[PDB]
Amino acid sequence: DDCQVTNPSTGHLFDLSSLSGRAGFTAAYSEKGLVYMSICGENENCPPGVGACFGQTRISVGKANKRLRYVDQVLQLVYKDGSPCPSKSGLSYKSVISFVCRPNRPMLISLDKQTCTLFFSWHTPLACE
Secondary structure (H helix, E strand, C coil), X not given: CCCEEECCCCCCEEECHHHECXXXXXXXXXXXXXXXXXXCCCCCCXXXXXXXXXXXXXXXXXXXXXXXXXXXXXXXXXXXXXXXXXXXXXXXXXXXXXXXXXXXCCEEEEEECCCCEXXXXXXXHHHCC
16 A cells, blocks of 8 residues: 555544655664664665564564554554564564654564564654644
8 A cells, every 4th residue: 555544533644654765763672682664665774575674683573565554543554474483383573563643763662472573653743633
């Protein structure tokens, strides 16, 4: 799709395209590590097609896409089909990136080792109606 989504109640159109680009961003990981991440497309520091990856290793924590969704005033991307999960049988990492209205850096708030899901939050004016 197009890195946009509408609030189906108000018809307000959200667009995260200004955050897009292969240069992307970083989020702090653990004591001194990081995750490279681009919005609505692959990150240049990551393998081809990969929207987010660990800084130390460039191992993928999810394939980029631009499928933006709206859920209870939050905008969300989900990058799935990352690298094999070091914990799980046949699971792959995924990254859930949640944008919340801020009246501008992604944060890694939780890593679910059981499902190899990384949860990110990004407080940004772009998620405000």
